[PDB]
Amino acid sequence: EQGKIFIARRSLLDELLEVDHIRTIYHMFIALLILFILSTLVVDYIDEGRLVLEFSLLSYAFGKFPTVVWTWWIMFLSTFSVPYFLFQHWATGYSKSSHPLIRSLFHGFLFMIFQIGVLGFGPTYVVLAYTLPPASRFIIIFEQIRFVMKAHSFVRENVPRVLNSSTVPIPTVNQYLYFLFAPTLIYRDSYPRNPTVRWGYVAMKFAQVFGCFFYVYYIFERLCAPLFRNIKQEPFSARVLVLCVFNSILPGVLILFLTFFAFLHCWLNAFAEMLRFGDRMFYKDWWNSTSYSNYYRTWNVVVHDWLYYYAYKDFLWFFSKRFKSAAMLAVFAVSAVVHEYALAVCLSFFYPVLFVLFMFFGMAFNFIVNDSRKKPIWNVLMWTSLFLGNGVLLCFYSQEWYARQHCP
């Protein structure tokens, strides 16, 4: 059925990481991580005498931080007040008069030019006018598309209900506040309260997400930054770009895994415990995923739920009755254009090919294991080609940005 429910709980990681063999693999994994840090620390301290621990990268990357705090505050206050009060005025006075669609067409036009103007251009103009550095710029573009999705969902959940006619009004402001911080993008007034907020648990989960952030940063500074200096000096057409595309693969895997674990698990469980959200199904077991059609297991639940429910369903509605291939390629086109936009205005670079070649690589990987081929040779081949293929297109994107798009 179409909707959202609270069956799954507590996380898919927490479920496994107390099963004896997998728990002890996880404690060995943590033991290997902390010994990797202590090795790198005290073997480059005793050898050089510095204990450098360079805080150069993040100090530049976050750069103008008070301007992103200020524009996040006015963007939050906008998305909290003007969609709420505009929809409140609408629903209350719908069919008292205006038998033609004139009232709705005018009002929904005012809502659109709000969303495209204020919430589309306001973040994009303040981020490009001051020429924001990419990490602080990323936060503004990330939170922009978040608030655009929440504003769309809040008017998409309540607009079919009022027009099918008594006339169900807008929710309480005390529950709309809750939704704008809730671990989801689909609007509900139904969120089951777990018994209590564990203050020691959210202190531990915030220690975990800041621990994972500083670990990622430390590995990035120590292994990916010297690569970024030597692709910086002689960038153009070197055949020793091959040297570092065969040297960034293992750090690339560890950054992928710790960024996933930090943001999809530690962050969302900390916030979900403070709010007592209850669902906590924030990701599926992606690694077991085999193909796109029916049996896709997305690594990010909340984005796929929004994308399917509010793009696809309404695309298959208007387009045609049996061109389901035309509707799935239209969801790929909507995904491609918002991703290419997001990464392009984030990295100050138009290069549209990244997402569509990711989906061609996903077609290849899915194809080689979806012909009923369980055989571990094909699964090992899929994993090595996935890690190598992602590292190739990532450093080719970084090269094309840094060389041929820097020089004229």
Restricted to residues 215-274, the positions that interact with a copy of itself (CB under 8 A) are 239-240, 242-243, 246-247, 249-250, 253
Should residue 319 be labelled a site residue for a copy of itself when binding is judged by CB under 8 A?
no
Q: Which of 5, 43, 105, 197 binds a copy of itself (CB under 8 A)?
A: 43
Should residue 39 be labelled a site residue for a copy of itself when binding is judged by CB under 8 A?
yes
Residue 95 contact among a copy of itself, ligand 3VV, none, beta carbon within 5 to 8 Å by kind: none
Restricted to residues 359-398, the positions that interact with ligand 3VV (CB under 6 A) are 361-362, 386, 390
CB of 194 to a copy of itself, least distance (A): 22
Restricted to residues 272-291, the positions that interact with a copy of itself (CB under 8 A) are 285, 287-288
Should residue 291 be labelled a site residue for ligand 3VV when binding is judged by CB under 6 A?
no
Should residue 293 be labelled a site residue for ligand 3VV when binding is judged by CB under 6 A?
yes
User: Cβ closer to a copy of itself: 295 or 383?
Assistant: 383
* Residue with smallest beta-carbon separation from ligand 3VV: 362
Query: What's the Rg (C-alpha) of the chain?
Result: 24
The residue count for the chain: 408
Tell whether 217 is in a known binding site.
Answer: no
Residue 22 contact among a copy of itself, ligand 3VV, none, beta carbon within 5 to 8 Å by kind: a copy of itself
Specify whether 339 is catalytic.
yes
CB of 288 to a copy of itself, least distance (A): 6
**CB of 248 within 8 A of CB of 219?**
no
Stretch that binds a copy of itself, among 26-34, 79-87, 137-145, 189-197 (CB under 8 A): 26-34
Residue list, annotated binding site for cholesterol: 21
